[PDB]
Design a protein around this ligand. Structure first.
Ligand SMILES: N[C@@H](CCC(=O)N[C@@H](CS[C@@H]1c2ccccc2-c2ccccc2[C@H]1O)C(=O)NCC(=O)O)C(=O)O
Ligand SMILES: N[C@@H](CCC(=O)N[C@@H](CS[C@@H]1c2ccccc2-c2ccccc2[C@H]1O)C(=O)NCC(=O)O)C(=O)O
Lengths: 217, 217
């Protein structure tokens, strides 16, 4: 099968995993793992970083046959194209482009705070920043089944995961937004997702590496 | 006319600007201007932040009549799409997608350095990494005319931009890379581009904002 390479954690690859499962893809993984304190070895990835034929070597990577892909989003779009999970209208398309990109921004923000040396102090500030992010998501989604509109598409995977980690981080975070609440629920109800969540392949935590300041085991 | 909103610096919007020009889109701009130090007043933008009908208010933004778009890549594909500047085949789309995210990776690495108080102490280290990056681009492009292949697409705008910024950062960086130098001249030799760089609307620098440690002014 296809080979998904990434680190020993959730990080930014959950959407890929989920989607491979949703699509009935055949794949196996390679989960490199860093060593502990105090170096945090990377040797397992390093030794073959420039040995895999990847154009711009990085984690995660997807090896599908003769196709070698890097960049989380490109991976997502490749698999999206392979299975007809892209938006099919320009509106669906525009919505998807947007979600795709807002997701990473919100992701980068969570990540910045989780690696911040002064996590404790700047944070309650972050928490008060939440509601408003959620607010954007609720209103964008609206009355809609899925983020692009009437069709499940790959952004629904991106969306589900960040909404989840945000929710993981601030449990009440969704209380103000029902429809949001409903979406995870509806997402979790997709074909193979439920099985997958209960499976031995599921990797829900840690979201981050040891080093972190939050979500590190 | 469409309206392009962005700060009054190059930032990450250069690619849109080139594309609009290249596609001879009818448009107007609103280059919000930040105040100086020690406050960096952001009121020009802030005053209209939440009134533009934007899904997730941010900059840049593009308003094309009824349609409101945020997230640059989003912006670039929308326009790419109205003028057939997207990959046409599976191979093309994969290259374009990778490149799309890869530019954004190399981009943030730059800003990261450029807003780091410790900038002079970090440079030396950053400079080391540069050739390694150009090489990745030189090799990926190889003997293709365009980043995705035979035909120009919106990802060349993304590419020209980043490579140009790096070059600007370290003038010699494209020396070992004829491939690149040549891609740059070709890009810059495209009629509406040449034409635009000589226009009143051109804005090559500053690239970062006022609170940046490099290309701030
Ligand atoms: N833009 C790229 C991300 C590239 C990225 O930085 N890759 C990181 C892993 S994600 C990385 C990370 C590592 C551990 C734990 C968490 C994260 C993480 C989580 C979310 C978002 C981003 C990250 C990065 O810090 C990496 O280690 N790449 C290979 C290398 O540099 O040799 C993409 O979309 O794929
Ligand atoms: N992911 C979004 C970019 C979002 C981004 O951070 N926008 C910055 C503009 S780019 C941003 C930037 C700001 C000032 C000066 C330079 C830059 C810049 C330049 C190049 C690359 C990245 C940046 C960011 O700091 C911003 O001020 N958004 C509005 C807001 O926060 O309300 C996109 O790709 O469109």
């Amino acid at each position: 099968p296809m080979i998904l390479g990434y680190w020993n954690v959730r990080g930014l690859t959950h959407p890929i995993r989920l989607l491979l499962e949703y699509t009935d893809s055949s794949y196996e993984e390679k989960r490199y793992a860093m060593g502990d304190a105090p170096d945090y070895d990377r040797s397992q990835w390093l030794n073959e970083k420039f040995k895999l034929g990847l154009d711009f070597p990085n984690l995660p990577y997807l090896i599908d046959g003769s196709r070698k892909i890097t960049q989380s989003n490109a991976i997502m779009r490749y698999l999206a194209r392979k299975h007809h999970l892209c938006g099919e209208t320009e509106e669906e398309r525009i919505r998807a482009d947007i979600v795709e990109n807002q997701v990473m921004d919100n992701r980068m923000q969570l990540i910045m705070l989780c690696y911040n040396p002064d996590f404790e102090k700047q944070k309650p500030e972050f928490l008060k920043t939440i509601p408003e992010k959620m607010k954007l998501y609720s209103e964008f989604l609206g009355k809609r089944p899925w983020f692009a509109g009437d069709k499940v598409t790959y952004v629904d995977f991106l969306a589900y995961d960040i909404l989840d980690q945000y929710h993981i981080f601030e449990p009440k975070c969704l209380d103000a937004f029902p429809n949001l609440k409903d979406f995870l629920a509806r997402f979790e109800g997709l074909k193979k997702i439920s099985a997958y969540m209960k499976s031995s392949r599921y990797l829900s935590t840690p979201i981050f590496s040891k080093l972190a300041q939050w979500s590190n085991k």
